[PDB]
Ligand binder design. Sequence first.
Ligand SMILES: CCCCCCCC/C=C\CCCCCCCC(=O)O[C@H](COC(=O)CCCCCCCCCCCCCCC)COP(=O)([O-])OCC[N+](C)(C)C
Ligand SMILES: CC(C)CCC[C@@H](C)[C@H]1CC[C@H]2[C@@H]3CC=C4C[C@@H](O)CC[C@]4(C)[C@H]3CC[C@]12C
Ligand SMILES: CC(C)CCC[C@@H](C)[C@H]1CC[C@H]2[C@@H]3CC=C4C[C@@H](O)CC[C@]4(C)[C@H]3CC[C@]12C
Lengths: 133, 147, 98, 455
Amino acid sequence: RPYAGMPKEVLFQFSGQARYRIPREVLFWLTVASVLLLIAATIAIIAISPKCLDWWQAGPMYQIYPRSFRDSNKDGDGDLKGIQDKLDYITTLNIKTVWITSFYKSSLKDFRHAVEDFQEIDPIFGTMKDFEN
Amino acid sequence: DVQKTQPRSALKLYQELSLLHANELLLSRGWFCYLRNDNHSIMYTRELDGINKVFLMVLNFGESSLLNLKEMISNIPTRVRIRLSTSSAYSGREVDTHAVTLASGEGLILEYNTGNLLHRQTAFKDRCFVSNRACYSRVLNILYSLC
Amino acid sequence: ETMVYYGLPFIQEADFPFNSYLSKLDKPSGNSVSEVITSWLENMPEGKWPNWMTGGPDNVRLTSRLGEKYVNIMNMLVFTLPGTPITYYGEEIGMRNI
Amino acid sequence: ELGLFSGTCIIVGTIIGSGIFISPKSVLSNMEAVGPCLIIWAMCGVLATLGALCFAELGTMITKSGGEYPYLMEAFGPIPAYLFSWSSLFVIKPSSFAIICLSFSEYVCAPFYSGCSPPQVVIKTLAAAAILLISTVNALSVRLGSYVQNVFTAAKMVIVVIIIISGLVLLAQGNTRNFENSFEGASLSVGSISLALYNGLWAYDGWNQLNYITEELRNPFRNLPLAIIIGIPLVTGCYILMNVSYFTVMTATELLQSQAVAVTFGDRVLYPASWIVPLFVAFSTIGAANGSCFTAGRLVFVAGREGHMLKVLSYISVKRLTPAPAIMFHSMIAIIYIIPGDINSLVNYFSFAAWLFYGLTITGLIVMRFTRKELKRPIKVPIFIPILVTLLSVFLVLAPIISAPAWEYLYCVLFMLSGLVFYFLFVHYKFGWAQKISKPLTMHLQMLMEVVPPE
Ligand SMILES: CCCCCCCC/C=C\CCCCCCCC(=O)O[C@H](COC(=O)CCCCCCCCCCCCCCC)COP(=O)([O-])OCC[N+](C)(C)C
Ligand SMILES: CC(C)CCC[C@@H](C)[C@H]1CC[C@H]2[C@@H]3CC=C4C[C@@H](O)CC[C@]4(C)[C@H]3CC[C@]12C
Ligand SMILES: CC(C)CCC[C@@H](C)[C@H]1CC[C@H]2[C@@H]3CC=C4C[C@@H](O)CC[C@]4(C)[C@H]3CC[C@]12C
């Protein structure tokens, strides 16, 4: 009766109920219960996962005094071109943030400051394009 | 140039600490329980829930000392591994909790395994600090904020 | 007055005000350092982020304030405390004042 | 019938898929510079045209229903034809289904993890829930297979022009800082160039299954090599005009940070409605997966005649005319692929096995054209295009293993040779006991899954 090659009408006798009917719907409803239990599990993991740390909470800062870090053009005062040359040294400390103190066009470089233009780099530190590089 | 060739220098230790602080997941978002401290010594632990490993920093700001940690922490085994040291002589040497000595400016990062964390107890809820609490899941390998 | 810069739960402000209280220690004692740590962490609001700054351009460098024997113990301190460690240039090699 | 304009509109929509949204990160992490990684999309874009042209030859002269299984039967004998039927059932087709569904959860869960990478458990639990849902819908119904296809290819092209138009407008405003000093750190090496051709060519996957269109083409022989040499070269031009639109907005250092490249782009350029990119890309990526599951029952039928693969796999269910045993076996192998590996370790594993059989095919093109076969071929390609595709593919299959060896290649070579063992012990020798393990298996499966032989 099996006769493995089996067209439509013959196997409908066997596949009716005998033993192979209850596994079909119990396995079909298993894959359906799981599909909505994996999209339910991923929502439950995205919700309970806490926000990751921002860049200012993740790693140390490194405060640079720009007039004393690295001089490029032999004038005796450090500048923004010399800070850029040493950026490969700063990444061997695993620094995340480079904090550069004030470099604006100043008439007094101490006593908390005296800025002549809040949108210019002081000549001794470079030019506005040295900052963009 | 000189300090990055020497084996035990301030620059060499600084590159070991900022690397340890970068990828540990226990230093970045672990609890901070500040155990008691007499003058001339500071002790605090960093611990997370599902990590099953705590750090213990013992920093000596005094003259010198031979301090017994088994009475103070009450959570520590009798043999702990030194994850880092300021004098750098203790690269991976293990020490005895009964008698540890600190030479006037010595700091150790002791590291051991335990299931009894200090912040879960009741006597330490007054002296543990965390910004955003988050427990760890070993099977999922994720942080989760529900615990 | 410093902790007001952290903001309120509904009005946001500075991400953190810079903690310069470690830069004030002139004598390396255990209770002098312990007082700075617990004073910042208990006064801070709930879900905020601490930071530890052990030097600046406006104070004597660490090697001249405490001594060369305390350069290493002081970097291990601010890197294992909760929050962001802020380093001043030349404090990783142990510079000193001229 | 379909004209020449439609003769390309089917092929161009076929080539552009979810590869252009995932590969840029991987081709750039090996070129290291904006300049060279722009010539890779052209170099592999041309290499995909000579491939599809050579496949037009075999598609016209053999003229059989089988996709590529005939072309290896006609040239080399029965062992490469079987060895391809073996790998295209355990390696090529399942892993290409796992990369498309691994790349759909990178785009659904990237917005909810803004600023950082999502955990591996989230992008696998969401991929395993897409494979089971895509393979269950395509087994219960056929109308729902083609119901959402024409809409899913609309969202695919809506985004492709939004990224291009935006990346061109921004180029007029002078945002040229990124490719100003290109080629400066280019790490050209047989190690990197090969591994970067894998990821670039995966975005062209779908050029071999392009021969079916000749049946409805108005004038096939005159127009198909034309619809190919103007259709795919139109797509590679739409890739470098889309990979340029990435570097116009963001830098080479921020690209490697995110796996979902187009999500990083929509936040930077389309802030009022930036959710449009992760929503539309999730549409197209789940539409390209629908196309893979449809063709799973195709090759097993043609290989089921020659007694190479088991004949039960081609059986159709009676209630719904869908190849149920072919599908639920095609996806069950994919679930076992998303568990160990991730996208980058699977594009290498896929483009390795797929490219040796891509080579053996077009070498059989010349070998049959050189000595063995003298039958007439309607359209003829020059001799210099196939010798290039084989000399290129022999570099693609053999350079990665020696220069950048990995554990992914080992499991790929062990799979085919395992099928080579199944050749002699199951089909070549025809042992007596070998039969009595098959016969009770097939109809019991037929008994349990109510499936029926097709004809
Ligand atoms: C076809 C289209 C498919 C979808 C496309 C994309 C759709 C979305 C498109 C676009 C995204 C739209 C903008 C979203 C902005 C961010 C919103 C946000 O964070 O809300 C959260 C809501 O809280 C939650 O719990 C959100 C749960 C999200 C579940 C996602 C669906 C998973 C299954 C998809 C279907 C799979 C079907 C597979 C079979 C087909 C905030 O909650 P929180 O607690 O404040 O923060 C917790 C998380 N962090 C931030 C801490 C990390
Ligand atoms: C069809 C019915 C009967 C069974 C379905 C079982 C499915 C839903 C189960 C079986 C094994 C499971 C996987 C087991 C392990 C992993 C690795 C983990 O990092 C992410 C989840 C993932 C990938 C699981 C996804 C769900 C999974 C594929
Ligand atoms: C099939 C396509 C054309 C349908 C989408 C049409 C609309 C929504 C698209 C087409 C071109 C798009 C513009 C392309 C470029 C820019 C410049 C960018 O700095 C801001 C967004 C802006 C201004 C886009 C806004 C949305 C836009 C107008």
